[PDB]
Each structure stands twice: as C-alpha cells, then as structure tokens.
Amino acid sequence: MDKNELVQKAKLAEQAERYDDMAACMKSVTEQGAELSNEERNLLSVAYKNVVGARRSSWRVVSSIEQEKKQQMAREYREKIETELRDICNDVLSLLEKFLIPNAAESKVFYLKMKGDYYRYLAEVAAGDDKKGIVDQSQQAYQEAFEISKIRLGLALNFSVFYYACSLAKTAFDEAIADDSTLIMQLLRDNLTLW
C-alpha cells in the first residue's frame, strides 16, 4: 500500500484543485494505521470540507429555486445531490468514528467538532423521523467537544451556529478576550452582528 506516496498524492491533488481525488487520497490514508501527522490531519480536513462543501453549496441554491412540472425536475435534481452529499458525510463521518476519534491530545476535540459538523450537514439534509436522531447525534458529538476544549476557538463558533444559541456564542467568545485565532473570533462577533 505505501502511505508516504499516497500522501504526496493527496497533496499533489490539491496543488491542482481536484478535491475528490484529494479527499479520496486521504481516505486511503486515514484507513491505514490512524494517528495523523498534524499536516496529514489537515489535508483530510480541508479536502473533505471542499468536496462536501461543493455539494452543500449547490444543495442550497436548488432547494430554493424549487419552492410546477419544472419543480419535480428540481426535486429530482436535489434528490441526486443530497445523495452524493450523504455519500460524503457518511463516507467520512464513518472514518472518524471508526479510525480517527479512537486514536488520539487536541485532535480529540478537532475530530469531535468535525464529527458533529458532518451530522449537522446531514441534519440540514434529512426529512423524515431520521432527522431527530441525526440532530441529537450531532449535539452529543459537539457538546462533547465544547466541554473537552475547556481550534477550540473554531469549535465554539460551529457549535454556536448549529443551534439556529447566541448565548453559547458570547460566552465562549467573551472569555477568549484575554493572527489565526483573531480571524475566527471576528466571525463569532459577526455572527451576533447577524443575530
């Protein structure tokens, strides 16, 4: 198999914008012997965010566009992406639970964030009774990270938004007041700026 080449590959894919080839190059790597070099730990985080993002972005536009015959055409299109989307979270969400979270320091909150992230993603998507279980599933996953942090920064944000709430925001924000970190914060403020 040779991990240190499938990494060089995962890198080389991003060095050329192909995010699926990338996200994939990492899957092979995560599904090797876990505990990922903070760099490796990174590539996967992003590759995957792009990929599911791409689809997440698109899901957004069409759901609205939809809202007659032309619309069954939309749902049929939504349906199709909701699918690759699901395929991506589920794909990664798994890796996490069956490889990533169990093989960790700081990472443990990182992953736990991400884990709750992806169900959040799936949560946006769900419909029938499935939804409730996915939502709760994310929370416990997120809530678990909120407490373990006590990066952590980024987390506070995402958990924060996940609620829409603000209450949790100002709190984890306010305390922080005491370049990278900066950025994130701006956003949470900005979030309240919104709410």
């Binding site: 990174n42 985080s45 992003v46 965010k49 980024g154 944000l157 995402n158 924060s160 938004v161 829409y164 950025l183 994130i184 979030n191 919104l194 709410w195």
Partner: peptide, 7 residues
C-alpha cells in the same frame, strides 16, 4: 445563516 471556518 452564519458559519463556520476555512483552510
């Protein structure tokens, strides 16, 4: 609305 991160 809102979110979320970057890389």
């Amino acid at each position: 609305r809102s979110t979320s991160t970057p890389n």
